């Protein structure tokens, strides 16, 4: 019924800044000012994402955390920088190190409080606080490390309210660091304990959607962030729109996660892409369903073939004959009837909203709790065990104050999460 | 026939006389008892003080229906009252204890960064 | 010497009411009591103007005695001598004898005694009552036992109304009859049965009355009774006293019940037809159609016969008549007693109620015969009785007012006895 | 010699209100005032049904009881409402429930007293109280339930005096409730112990006289009550008329009921609706014309009272009546002699030049109870709707007790098709 | 006498919102509260209180733990109808789970509601009972409703409670856990109700599609239909006329056993705007297609039947109709209880919402039947439940708000029991 946003670490922020500027456009908000747009609905739920301040003005409920100036002055000197409250920025000065220990223990918990001090202000000045959602990288340190710290420090303060993360799972192709495995695994363990849902955005997947289907040669952190921003908008829609009726995000949880551990969703989007490549809008509903459900079109690098669907949420977009949505959606659970678990009845719910995203006459987006996710972790825990092998780059953590066996512990834990997703291809 | 009539008495406003016709031809209620009259009064006063102590019979049970009705109602209310308070402060004591059970792993993986940052006090 | 009438219970009352009427006409006493010894046998010359009957009237409902103290004659009796008792006997002996009787008996018995008190040689009692019906059967019985106690020698003559299916009140009638007649029995001396059916029959053939009233019947009975009491109100040989009544008629203490046969019953309007001969009326006496109790005496035998003539008669016709009643008939006399006919003439011509149904006659006869034939009615009754009691049919109403099942047994027992006695007198 | 009237429960009152307005017309009484009519007899026995008060005025000896305002303001706002004493009405406020337990125990004995308080006030100011008669439904709660309670509370106060009821015995066709069996059976037991005569008015019968012989399509509680009101008038005639002589109502009892239990009369009426003597006898004696749903063929007559009406050659009545007990001689029990008595009264009812009405103690009644005890055992079977009583404070086996008792009354009506 | 409505939770609220609407049309009360007809200077008085000297206020209370839905009421005309008081809202959701609704978020608001209700009882000279409208699935509908009923049971002795539940359907559904919630409440909820009117959302949705032509029927589409069925049931005792005229009485006819509450409703002519014989509508009542809970009653047996007519009817036809319902169909009456049909006619012709989807009818029927057949929905539900709990599928969300694993065990235990009871009424 009203939610705060933490946005930490280089990737966390580059994503967030785009997310924000995308939604700010759905509702219609100036760089600073307020509403300008012939639609009316918009501000029904503007409440949820925008704590509004003096004059007109609509300031977003956003904390930005980072461990160096760097990518904060990026947002402030760029797209929609005039929007975020001037002191919802928590700086860093020091390094991130691109090192989880640094982020989670030393250079991070150094800061930590001044972030909590600010989350406690926005939250304490909520009417009925839904919970928190956080964006961040999983490999590389300030994003994952301090992030997982923050959530651990957020629970405890607010066990109460629910925990949501957009967590970009890192990959060999399009990565800056030999250590990503470590950083990812160490947080993956943290997440399984401390959040209630995590959106698994695979950086691997993202890139694949750009070469394998997009004729996009050399992909920026940009036309890639564009995917997540789009994905995020469509995932959040129900929290911030209709009157049909509401999405508690607590409701989202209770309905999507059968078992307390397995909150790992693969998102997926309907139509995709960019500039002088978008010319389609020949997107149809049939052609829209097949596409939002195609493995080639997940936001996590894993084909939901190996592994069935536990529960699925799917949410369309744009004034279209939803009479047809119902029966197309029903066709997906028939031409694929086997791949939706038999023991959770009516386990895919679909909703429509009739206000299109940026461009695009028609759209849709898909949230899936799938055991196909199993594959993702395996594939990080496979290049991880591969390093922890003869204890590779570890000394960077060893001597930041961290324990030899605290890795085996996070390795163990995650390898279990693989074991359980596997336990659930049952009878 | 031809009768023979013996004349028994002549009078002022009358006169009797037999006529034997043909020869004939052959050769203490006591008191005491309205002792009876009151044993009827007695057998009445019994038989009727009976179909009366038979109706005090019919009565007392009247009370007992009206009374075992309401009596078995304070059964329902004064049992559904503490089938709640001791299943709803059984419940409140449940999650209240479970909230701490959570705040616990979290006080511990906390006094753990404390324990291995006082571990960073050794690096040469 | 003197002579007290008692009339107990509706039937009894109205009968009386209509003979006292006749007596008054016969002695020229106006309802105001005043006329302008002889007949002192029935009346007391109280005050110095009036005449008051030596009578007492009792009923447990006021209704009937009430009517007497409305209609001229209202002046005739003493306000005292008419006792009434608030609640009914409700058609059953048991109630009359024990339940409602008991109460009033003490008053009645005393008031009666107040009449005895002004009688210098009181002779006995004439009790008028119904056979069936509650107070007539019930109270009468209680009375008679008591009367028997308080009055030693004194004869008791009863005039009972033997009930008939047609003009009847009650279903239990038989029970009440057999019940009283049992108790009632060894307290009476001589008893005049009046079969209501016969009376009703004489009225129909002989008077022309399509459906004869109670007061229609009563007038006729008035006559028969006035014929019987006659002898002791004018004094004139043959039954000048109540002693003589049993002497002359009843030869066995048990066998009380003589059979009366009143002479010319002929309707006014016939009033001018040439009168009937001394022989005809005499003969009319031997006609069962002109009888007073529905039975057949040329069947049973005769054990004592009496002919009470009233009017213009020299005995030398009375004789000549009897002559040819034998010459031309069923003689019928029983084995061991003369061939009687005690004949009384009382010169006083019979008067009749002026707006009545019977015409003024020159000479009338009466004939009291104690014939075993009358036992026909004794059976006709018992068979009704027997065949209800055979099922306790109404017994429970008596045991109700606290009587004994065994009393019925015991009272029927006596009628079996009587019916035997009676037949056991033939040959 | 003077009688009070209790009139309890929706049916009880809808009947009573009609009965009263019918007789009040025979005697001739204004809505309020007194006599207006060229006849004279009328007020001879007006005593019996009308305790009379100040001015002229003739107020009837009536208590009206109910467990909710409803059908009392019905009578007061309608036909002859201005007549009953303003405080001879005992209200209810609460429900009846259409539930015997409610009526006989809880919601009823709640009131009870304020009724007795009033009955005691009419009775205590009688000259010679004959007894009480009560009208009421037998299925449905306030009528039967509180009623049977009332009579039980009336005996005990007055064992003494006799108990009379017009009790309407409910049926499948023209009924509102699934529970009627229970309510009826429960009171039937009650009645057999506490009254001295009950007129068995079968609601089934009533309806039958409207379709089978009436051409009356869709019958109200109205043109049906009209039958009972007519039947009641003619049944009571002997209490409130002649001088030939009287009917003690005690006398009625002692003469009609041979056995203490079997006081169950089927009434019958002569002409009907909304006539010669021969045609009048055949008709008052026809099964098609009883007030109880039972053909007096199966079952003989114990005792019968029949009472004609209207200036007519009663010479012909005698011999027509005798003809009925001949062309049917077999169907009047042999062991009660002269067991049918007939009387005439020569003042006609509402309309109708000629009339007649018949009271019969007949073992054909046997069939009525069977037929209620047959839809009753059918329910008590797997203990049907019983929980509505169970938990109003009543006993499991108090039903078996009333079932038993009544099933005996069937047994005895049967015992009496006997011999000689 | 009087008669308080409670609408707990979204579904409950909107249903009520749409019969209170209908009641107002049926008695000529403008949203303004004021009505220029009859008196109040009773009849209409069972459900309304003549408060002030101009207005009419429903004897109602609305509760929901999210404001959203109750808020809408205090926006759109009717806003004027209720008292600002009587609509309670609760800041935070129930979040689609009983455990939350019954213990965690309920607990708080229950004390206020229970009292406000009491404030309505306070102005009722012979209050008769409560009509509770709620969903079967859904958090506050199952959860709070339960808590309420226990409490109501305590605070109000005799007083009958009638529940109108919305038994949930796969298609027009909110939550996955729906089954859990339903079996959970229905267990607690069970021995606190007296008689309960199930509305199978699927069937409603089916009636709207075949009979109304609505390609994909709205919530307010369905509600209009339910409004009608409810108004047909409450009808009887909103005017007073012929049959079914106090709360014990009405229901003493439907349940034979302290369990077996749930009668089956079948509304007569549902036909779309843009007449039928007394016999036709009568017959339409025995068509499972025109039914009100997805099941099959020429299968199970009948243990009590009720026919509630509304409009222009002499019983002469009503009879003649019933005749040929028996000559030409599956009679089906159970062993040990008459062959009922309590027939009630209320002359008041059926009014319909003016810009609605159903046309003004001359005469409509209702038929409430307590048939063992309705147990079909009791299983159709349990099998859903059984096969989730078979794996603790979502249990952990309840134990979260501090519930007991054993309560599921215990609550299912009862449906096994019930499903037995029900089938255990057939044949001798
Ligand atoms: N001959 C004749 N018989 C009558 C008369 N009145 C009644 N009866 C008969 O008497 C019998 C009934 O006796 P009742 O005198 O009526 O009864 P009761 O108990 O003495 O008087 P109640 O107090 O009125 O009951 C029946 O056989 C009637 O036919 C009458 O006036 N004349
Ligand atoms: N018939 C009908 N069913 C509804 C309506 N709204 C929701 N439902 C159903 O009710 C169930 C969900 O109950 P809800 O009222 O939504 O849940 P709730 O907890 O009671 O209300 P919330 O506080 O909004 O969560 C599902 O079976 C829905 O199909 C409605 O307006 N009409
Ligand atoms: N999609 C997305 N992923 C990013 C972005 N920047 C870095 N990443 C991924 O996240 C990981 C590094 O995260 P980073 O934010 O640089 O670490 P931090 O600033 O120290 O928290 C690498 O595996 C990258 O692939 C971004 O711009 N968008
Ligand atoms: N004939 C007659 N019977 C009625 C009347 N009203 C109800 N009944 C019958 O009596 C039974 C119900 O009695 P009722 O008076 O409604 O119950 P109560 O008011 O609670 O005592 C049903 O079987 C009806 O058939 C009436 O108007 N006249
Ligand atoms: C798995 O089926 C469900 C999945 C999620 C939810 N929860 S929700 O209320 O927050 C929700 C929707 F109901 C919905 F229809 C959506 F499209 C959606 F994105 C969503 F979160 C409810 C469900 F029944
Ligand atoms: C069985 O026949 C009788 C029925 C009743 C009575 N007693 S009664 O006084 O109550 C009575 C009548 F005698 C009578 F002729 C009636 F018509 C009558 F209604 C009546 F009650 C006497 C009977 F012989
Ligand atoms: Mg008598
Ligand atoms: Mg009623
Ligand atoms: Mg909810």
What is the domain-level CATH number for residue C317? 3.30.1330.20
Distance CA A344, CA E162 (A): 32
B59: CB partners within 8 A, 6+ apart: none
State the DSSP H helix or E strand holding residue D166, giving kind and residue range, or none if neither.
strand D162-169
Distance CA C302, CA A348 (A): 122
Say which DSSP state E58 is in. Answer: B
Q: Which two tokens stand for residue C379?
A: 């059976």
Q: How far is CA A67 from the centre of its chain?
A: 21
Same domain as E115, residue E89: yes
Spatial contact of D139 and D184, defined as CB atoms under 8 Å apart: yes
Best mutation site among A6, A10, A174, A230 for ligand 3, i.e. most ligand atoms within 8 A of its Cβ?
A10
3-state helix, strand, coil in chain E (%, to 5): 45, 15, 40
The SS3 call for residue C6 is strand
Spatial contact of A231 and A267, defined as CB atoms under 8 Å apart: yes
Which residues in chain E have Cβ-Cβ distances shorter than 8 Å to B83?
150
Distance CA E273, CA E50 (A): 34
Closest ligand 5 atom to residue A314 Cα is 17
Q: What are phi and psi of D89, to 5 degrees?
A: -95, 120
Spatial contact of D107 and D138, defined as CB atoms under 8 Å apart: no
Q: Which two tokens stand for residue E258?
A: 């302290």
Distance CA E375, CA E296 (A): 10
Q: How far is CA C58 from CA C19, C44, C116, D217, in A?
A: 16, 20, 17, 59
Say which DSSP state D82 is in. Answer: T
Distance CA D217, CA E316 (A): 7
Work out how many domains chain E is built from and give that number.
3
CB of A238 closer than 6 angstroms to any ligand 5 atom: yes
Estimate the crossing angle of helix C214-230 against helix C196-205, to 10 degrees. Answer: 100
Q: What are phi and psi of A154, to 5 degrees?
A: -85, -50
In 3D space, the residue among A376, A366, A372 whose CA is nearest the CA of residue A308 turns out to be: A372
Is the sign of the CA dihedral D82, D84, D88, D89 positive or negative? Answer: negative
In 3D space, the residue among C382, C59, C26 whose CA is nearest the CA of residue C231 turns out to be: C26
Q: Domain D365-420 maps to which CATH number in 2.40.50.40, 1.10.287.600, 3.30.160.110, 3.90.1150.10?
A: 1.10.287.600
Same domain as C176, residue C78: yes
In 3D space, the residue among E131, E15, E7, E102 whose CA is nearest the CA of residue E64 turns out to be: E7
3-state helix, strand, coil in chain C (%, to 5): 45, 15, 40
Distance CA E77, CA D74 (A): 40
The SS3 call for residue C371 is strand
Tell me which method was used to determine the 3D structure: X-ray
Spatial contact of A191 and A198, defined as CB atoms under 8 Å apart: yes
Spatial contact of A344 and A371, defined as CB atoms under 8 Å apart: no
Q: Which of E351, E373, E395 is the last residue of a domain?
A: E373
Distance CA A372, CA D342 (A): 102
Q: Any idea of the CA torsion for D64, D66, D69, D74, to the nearest 10 degrees?
A: -50
Q: Which of C354, C373, C392 is the last residue of a domain?
A: C373
Q: How far is CA A20 from CA A45, A79, A115, A225, E96, in A?
A: 15, 10, 19, 12, 29
Spatial contact of D357 and D270, defined as CB atoms under 8 Å apart: yes
Q: Which residues surround ligand 9, an ion (CB under 5 A)?
A: E 94, 138-140
* Chains B, E: CB pairs < 8 Å: 35
A223: CB partners within 8 A, 6+ apart: A210, A216, A274
Spatial contact of E90 and E108, defined as CB atoms under 8 Å apart: yes
Note down the domain range covering E139. Answer: 1-263
CB of C67 closer than 6 angstroms to any ligand 1 atom: no
Q: State in words which class domain A1-258 has.
A: alpha beta
Find the closest chain B residue to E106 by CA distance: B88
CB of E285 closer than 6 angstroms to any ligand 2 atom: no
User: Where along chain A do the CATH 3.40.50.1440 domains lie?
Assistant: 1-258
Q: How far is CA E363 from the centre of its chain?
A: 22
Same domain as E354, residue E238: no
Q: Any idea of the CA torsion for D224, D227, D229, D234, to the nearest 10 degrees?
A: -170
Same domain as E135, residue E64: yes
CATH number, domain of C392, equals 1.10.287.600
Spatial contact of D22 and D350, defined as CB atoms under 8 Å apart: yes
In 3D space, the residue among C33, C37, C28 whose CA is nearest the CA of residue C2 turns out to be: C37
Distance CA E192, CA E173 (A): 27
Write the burial class of residue A216 (CB in 10 Å: 0-12 exposed, 13-18 middle, 19+ buried): middle
Same domain as C404, residue C367: no
Q: Whose CA is nearest to atom 27 of ligand 4?
A: D221
Q: What is the CATH number of domain A373-427?
A: 1.10.287.600
Q: How far is CA E421 from CA A388, E187, E338, E403, in A?
A: 63, 14, 21, 28
Q: Which two tokens stand for residue A96?
A: 């991130």
Topology of the domain covering A259-372: 60s Ribosomal Protein L30; Chain: A; (3.30.1330)
| B72 touching chain D per CB within 8 A | yes
In 3D space, the residue among C337, C338, C365, C369 whose CA is nearest the CA of residue C350 turns out to be: C365
Distance CA E66, CA E100 (A): 13
In 3D space, the residue among D336, D299, D301 whose CA is nearest the CA of residue D420 turns out to be: D336
Distance CA D198, CA C196 (A): 34
Same domain as E246, residue E380: no
Task: Write down how long chain B is.
Answer: 124
User: Where along chain D do the CATH 3.30.1330.20 domains lie?
Assistant: 259-364
In 3D space, the residue among A343, C340, B49, C24 whose CA is nearest the CA of residue E385 turns out to be: A343
Distance CA C134, CA E227 (A): 73
DSSP states along A129-188: --EEEEEEESSSHIIIIIHHHHHHHHTTT-SSSEEEEEEEE--SSS-S-TTHHHHHHHHH
Q: Kindly report the CA angle at D160 between D158 and D163, in degrees rounded to 5?
A: 75
Q: Report the 10 Å Cβ neighbour count for A51.
A: 19
User: Where along chain D do the CATH 1.10.287.600 domains lie?
Assistant: 365-420
Distance CA C272, CA C269 (A): 7
Q: How far is CA A180 from the centre of its chain?
A: 18
In 3D space, the residue among E126, E110, E97 whose CA is nearest the CA of residue E1 turns out to be: E126
Spatial contact of C256 and C368, defined as CB atoms under 8 Å apart: no
Q: How far is CA A196 from the centre of its chain?
A: 12
* Chains C, D: CB pairs < 8 Å: 67
In 3D space, the residue among D396, D338, D332, D416 whose CA is nearest the CA of residue D101 turns out to be: D396
Spatial contact of C219 and C353, defined as CB atoms under 8 Å apart: yes
Q: Report the 10 Å Cβ neighbour count for A115.
A: 22
| C329 touching chain B per CB within 8 A | no
DSSP states along B37-100: HHHHHHHHHHHHHHHHHTHHHHHHHHHHHHHHHHTTHHHHHHHHSTTTTTSSTTTHHHHHHHHH
In 3D space, the residue among A100, A104, A103 whose CA is nearest the CA of residue A68 turns out to be: A103
Same domain as C122, residue C212: yes
Q: How far is CA D125 from CA D2, D4, D118, D121, E416, in A?
A: 11, 11, 11, 6, 66
Distance CA D189, CA D6 (A): 20
Q: Which two tokens stand for residue D221?
A: 């509680």
Write out A45-71 in H/E/C secondary structure.
CHHHHCCCCCCCCCCCCEEEECCCCCC
DSSP states along C126-157: EEEEESSSHHHHHHHHHHHHHHHHH-SS-EEE
What order do you get walking across the sheet with D301-309 strand by strand? Answer: D89-90, D62-65, D4-8, D131-137, D162-169, D197-202, D264-269, D355-362, D301-309, D340-345
Residue showing tokens 């108790």 = C183
Spatial contact of C235 and C38, defined as CB atoms under 8 Å apart: yes
Same domain as C263, residue C145: no
Residue among E150, E153, E402 whose CB faces B94 most closely = E402
Write the burial class of residue C364 (CB in 10 Å: 0-12 exposed, 13-18 middle, 19+ buried): buried
Spatial contact of C353 and C24, defined as CB atoms under 8 Å apart: no
User: Which residues are registered as beta bridge partners of D340?
Assistant: D304
Burial E222-233 (b: 16+ CB within 10 A, else e): bbbbbbbbbbbb
Same domain as C281, residue C304: yes
Which residues in chain E have Cβ-Cβ distances shorter than 8 Å to D93?
126
Write the burial class of residue E65 (CB in 10 Å: 0-12 exposed, 13-18 middle, 19+ buried): buried
Count of CA atoms in the C-beta half-sphere (13 A) of E413: 8
In 3D space, the residue among C348, C343, C384, C364 whose CA is nearest the CA of residue C264 turns out to be: C364
Write the burial class of residue E174 (CB in 10 Å: 0-12 exposed, 13-18 middle, 19+ buried): buried
Q: CB under 8 Å, gap of 24 or more: what pairs does D210-213 form?
A: D212/D288, D213/D272, D213/D288, D213/D289
Q: Which of C342, C358, C373 is the last residue of a domain?
A: C373
Spatial contact of C268 and C357, defined as CB atoms under 8 Å apart: yes
The SS3 call for residue E175 is coil
CB of E138 closer than 6 angstroms to any ligand 2 atom: yes
Superfamily (CATH H level) for D259-364: Tubulin/FtsZ, C-terminal domain (3.30.1330.20)
In 3D space, the residue among D140, D134, D16 whose CA is nearest the CA of residue D78 turns out to be: D16
DSSP states along D269-290: ESS-----SHHHHHHHS-GGGB
Count of CA atoms in the C-beta half-sphere (13 A) of A411: 18
D275: CB partners within 8 A, 6+ apart: D352, D353, D354, D355
Same domain as C347, residue C330: yes
Task: Write down how long chain E is.
Answer: 428
Distance CA A10, CA D289 (A): 104
Spatial contact of C377 and C294, defined as CB atoms under 8 Å apart: yes
Spatial contact of C398 and C172, defined as CB atoms under 8 Å apart: no
User: Where along chain A do the CATH 3.30.1330.20 domains lie?
Assistant: 259-372
Spatial contact of D50 and D6, defined as CB atoms under 8 Å apart: no
Q: What are phi and psi of A69, to 5 degrees?
A: -40, -65
Distance CA C132, CA C384 (A): 12
DSSP states along D190-258: HHHHH-SEEEEEEHHHHHHHHHTTT---S--SHHHHHHHHHHHHHHHGGGSS-SS----SHHHHHHH-S
Distance CA A258, CA A249 (A): 15
Burial D340-370 (b: 16+ CB within 10 A, else e): bbbbbbeeebeeeebbbbbbbbbbbbbbbbb
Distance CA A217, CA B38 (A): 132
Q: What is the CATH number of domain B28-124?
A: 6.10.280.30
Write the burial class of residue E428 (CB in 10 Å: 0-12 exposed, 13-18 middle, 19+ buried): exposed
Q: What are phi and psi of C109, to 5 degrees?
A: -50, -40
Distance CA D195, CA D165 (A): 7
In 3D space, the residue among D177, D246, D232 whose CA is nearest the CA of residue D357 turns out to be: D232
Same domain as E90, residue E58: yes
Distance CA D337, CA C171 (A): 7
- Taking only Cα atoms into account, the Rg of chain C, rounded to an integer number of angstroms, comes to 21
CA of E146 to the centre of ligand 9 (A): 13
CATH number, domain of C40, equals 3.40.50.1440
Distance CA E234, CA E344 (A): 12
The two beta strands, D301-309 and D355-362, are: antiparallel
| D390 touching chain B per CB within 8 A | no
Mutation site, A103, A105, A154, interface B, largest B CB count within 10 A: A105
Is the sign of the CA dihedral D124, D127, D130, D136 positive or negative? Answer: negative
The SS3 call for residue C254 is coil
């Amino acid at each position: 019924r009203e939610i705060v946003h933490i946005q930490a670490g280089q990737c966390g922020n580059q994503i967030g800044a785009k997310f924000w500027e995308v939604i700010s456009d759905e509702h219609g908000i100036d760089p600073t000012g307020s509403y300008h747009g012939d639609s009316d609905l918009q501000l029904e739920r503007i409440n949820v994402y925008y704590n509004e301040a003096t004059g007109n003005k609509y300031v977003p409920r956003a904390i930005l955390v980072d461990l160096e100036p760097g990518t904060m002055d990026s947002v402030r000197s760029g797209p929609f920088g005039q929007i975020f409250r001037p002191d919802n920025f928590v700086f860093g000065q020091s390094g991130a190190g691109n090192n989880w220990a640094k982020g989670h223990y030393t250079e991070g918990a150094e800061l930590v409080d001044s972030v909590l001090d600010v989350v406690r202000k926005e939250s304490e000045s909520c009417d009925c606080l839904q919970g928190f959602q956080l964006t961040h990288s999983l490999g590389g340190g300030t994003g994952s490390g301090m992030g997982t710290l923050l959530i651990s420090k957020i629970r405890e303060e607010y066990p109460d309210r629910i925990m949501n993360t957009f967590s970009v799972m890192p990959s060999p192709k399009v990565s800056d660091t030999v250590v990503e495995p470590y950083n990812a695994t160490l947080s993956v363990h943290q997440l399984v304990e401390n959040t209630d849902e995590t959106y698994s955005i695979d950086n691997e997947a993202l890139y694949d959607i750009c070469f394998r289907t997009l004729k996009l040669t050399t992909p920026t952190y940009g036309d890639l962030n564009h995917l997540v921003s789009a994905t995020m908008s469509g995932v959040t829609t129900c929290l911030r729109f209709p009157g049909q009726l509401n999405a508690d995000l607590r409701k989202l949880a209770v309905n999507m996660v059968p078992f307390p551990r397995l909150h790992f969703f693969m998102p997926g989007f309907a139509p995709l892409t960019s500039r002088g490549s978008q010319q389609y809008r020949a997107l149809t509903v049939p052609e829209l369903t097949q596409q939002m459900f195609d493995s080639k079109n997940m936001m996590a690098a894993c084909d939901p073939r190996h592994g069935r669907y536990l529960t699925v949420a799917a949410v369309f977009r744009g004034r279209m004959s939803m009479k047809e949505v119902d029966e197309q959606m029903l066709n997906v659970q028939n031409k694929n009837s086997s791949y939706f678990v038999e023991w959770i009845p009516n386990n895919v719910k679909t909703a429509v909203c009739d206000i299109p995203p940026r461009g695009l006459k028609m759209s849709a987006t898909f949230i899936g709790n799938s055991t196909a996710i199993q594959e993702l972790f395996k594939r990080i825990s496979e290049q991880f065990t591969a390093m922890f092998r003869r204890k590779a780059f570890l000394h960077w953590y060893t001597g930041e104050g961290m324990d030899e066996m605290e890795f085996t512990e996070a390795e163990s834990n995650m390898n279990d999460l693989v074991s359980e997703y596997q336990q659930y291809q049952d009878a | 026939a031809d009768m023979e009539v013996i004349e028994l008495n002549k009078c002022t406003s009358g006169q009797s006389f037999e006529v034997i016709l043909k020869p004939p031809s052959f050769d203490p209620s006591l008191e005491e008892i309205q002792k009876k009259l009151e044993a009827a009064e007695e057998r009445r006063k019994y038989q009727e003080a009976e179909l009366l102590k038979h109706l005090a019979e019919k009565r007392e049970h009247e009370r007992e229906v009206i009374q075992k009705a309401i009596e078995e109602n304070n059964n329902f209310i004064k049992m559904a009252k503490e089938k709640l308070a001791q299943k709803m402060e059984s419940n409140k004591e449940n999650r209240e204890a479970h909230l701490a059970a959570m705040l616990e792993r979290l006080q511990e993986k906390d006094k753990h960064a404390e324990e291995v940052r006082k571990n960073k006090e050794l690096k040469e | 010497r003197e002579c007290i009438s008692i009339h107990v219970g509706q039937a009894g009352v109205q009968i009386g009411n209509a003979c006292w009427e006749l007596y008054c006409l016969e002695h020229g006493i106006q309802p105001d009591g005043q006329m302008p010894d002889s007949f002192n046998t029935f009346f007391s010359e109280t005050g110095a103007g009036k005449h008051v009957p030596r009578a007492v009237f009792v009923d447990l409902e006021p209704t009937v005695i009430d009517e007497v103290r409305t209609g001229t004659y209202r002046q005739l009796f003493h306000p005292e001598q008419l006792i009434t008792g608030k609640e009914d006997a409700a058609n059953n002996y048991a109630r009359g004898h024990y339940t409602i009787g008991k109460e009033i008996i003490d008053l009645v018995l005393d008031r009666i005694r107040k009449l005895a008190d002004q009688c210098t040689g009181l002779q006995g009692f004439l009790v008028f009552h119904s056979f069936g019906g509650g107070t007539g059967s019930g109270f009468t019985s209680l009375l008679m036992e008591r009367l028997s106690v308080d009055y030693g020698k004194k004869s008791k003559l009863e005039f009972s109304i033997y009930p008939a299916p047609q003009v009847s009140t009650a279903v239990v009638e038989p029970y009440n009859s057999i019940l009283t007649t049992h108790t009632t029995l060894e307290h009476s001396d001589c008893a005049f049965m009046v079969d209501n059916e016969a009376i009703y029959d004489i009225c129909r053939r002989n008077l022309d009355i399509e459906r004869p009233t109670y007061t229609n019947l009563n007038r006729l009975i008035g006559q028969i009774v006035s014929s019987i009491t006659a002898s002791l109100r004018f004094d004139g040989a043959l039954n000048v006293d109540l002693t003589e009544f049993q002497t002359n008629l009843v030869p066995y203490p048990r066998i009380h019940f003589p059979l009366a046969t009143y002479a010319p019953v002929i309707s006014a309007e016939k009033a001018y037809h040439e009168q009937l001969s001394v022989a005809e009326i005499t003969n009319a006496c031997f006609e069962p159609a002109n009888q007073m109790v529905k039975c057949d005496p040329r069947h049973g035998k005769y054990m004592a016969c009496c002919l009470l003539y009233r009017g213009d008669v020299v005995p030398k016709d009375v004789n000549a008549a009897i002559a040819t009643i034998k010459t031309k008939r069923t003689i019928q006399f029983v084995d061991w007693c003369p061939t009687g006919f005690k004949v009384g003439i009382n010169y006083q011509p019979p008067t009749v109620v002026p707006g009545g149904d019977l015409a003024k006659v020159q000479r009338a006869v009466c004939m009291l015969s104690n014939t075993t034939a009358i036992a026909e009615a004794w059976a006709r009754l018992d068979h009704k009785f027997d065949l209800m009691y055979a099922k306790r049919a109404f017994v429970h109403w008596y045991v109700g007012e606290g009587m004994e099942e065994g009393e019925f047994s015991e009272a029927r027992e006596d009628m079996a006895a009587l019916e035997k006695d009676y037949e056991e007198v033939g040959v």
